[model samples]
Target: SHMASMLPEETILDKLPKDFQERITSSKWKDRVEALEEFWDSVLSQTKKLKSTSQNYSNLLGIYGHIIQKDANIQAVALAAQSVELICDKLKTPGFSKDYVSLVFTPLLDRTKEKKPSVIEAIRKALLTICKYYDPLASSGRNEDMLKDILEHMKHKTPQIRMECTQLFNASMKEEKDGYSTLQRYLKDEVVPIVIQIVNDTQPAIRTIGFESFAILIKIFGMNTFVKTLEHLDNLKRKKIEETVKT
Candidate 1:
């Protein structure tokens, strides 16, 4: 079997105490934690083996979603994120169908709702890894859907989310394909206005990223589009200045 073939002669799974394996779902927190650590280590040690097998890939994908969403342990969540990054790295290479890409990413996209800073950071890194494999212009609508999701996150309350959106935006634009025109639409209609509003946000960091995103859009769309967009922004600036002056 393909799954069996992927295993090393002395796999870490074999080394793990059988009792500890059963305790992964134990009622006691300490037992569960211990099992989680050992299991995570086994997974890490066997990453290459696991990814090499289609069956293992499918099973691990489900586990990745489960751990990211349901596991109470932060370490498990972080390890799941690393696993996602590893899987995406392998999937980025040739031979895998586009369906696998969607399968891997859809749940991860959902997991972005996680509020923990560390978890969110790991998700961001995993997303960036997936981005390396994506071609915005690919005929598959998956990339388009992914782009839409990323754009939606551009307005997220979390700065990290917004920052990652900008990073994805920049990466997407680098390809300069027909798909980029769709992104151009989003920038002109949605993202540009948001950047203008936040360019002077109360938080200095937000203001910095907001302006950086604005500049990125300008760089992608060029001086003429930037000038045109700025006209719209100019109006908002005028209104804000007028309101301040009136006060």
Candidate 2:
């Protein structure tokens, strides 16, 4: 019940029935977005239901995933998020957990790298609503399964994927006492070492975020570990980070 921006577009409120299931799943984005406009406008004004039954949920959810993966149309992205938000509301009795939830999750996660306020607000609200309804990290075993994605993607083939995974690394830990201590172990054994290795990537963008990650690391892990981390770096790199600090 945290307020998420579930606001849809200005409902045109004109009733011309649309085959939204068919139209939303169209191959062309032009057709699909127009379909989305109809769903948000012509439909959704009175109804909460997305599909006739839960059996077709994955097909409905899959279309949102496809829309989410494309970033050309910002309104299209925001609308897809509102669509997912509404679906999660309709299914709130016991929201979609595990299984096809992954279908729409990561693409939404990827778009967090975009700095758009309206888009980010929609995605932030979408993620919160989905996580509220779904319980991916509610149990211990499932959290363990879910968290391994961070470490695995650090070695991703695409530089942006690797960068996003690195962002996930910083985002994953918390301020709570027990959780902070839990992450400390990984920071030492795996996180720091690999993140230190991240400083040497061929891409300049990757190199910048790696050091930015290091800055985030030192704030949590402290300047002593910061010194320890930079000691292992090449002299020029180490000098710049040292110069970056205020005494």
Best by TM-score: 1
Clashing pairs in 2: none
lDDT of 2 by residue, 1-247 (tens): 6978674422212343457667666666777688777676655545554332334466656777778877477778888888777766665534454565777877776666555788777876776665455433233334444445556567666676677666555554422233354456556777777777667788877776677667666666678966766887989767655554432
lDDT score for residue 13 of model 2: 23
Question: Which ranges in model 1 have alpha carbons more than 4 Å from their true place?
Answer: 1-56, 93-120, 136-142, 157-160, 174-182, 197-200, 234-247
How much lDDT does each candidate structure score? 0.60, 0.63
TM-scores, all models, native as reference = 0.66, 0.61
* Candidate 2 C-alpha error for residue 40, in Å: 3.9
Residue 238, candidate 2: Cα error in Å is 3.0
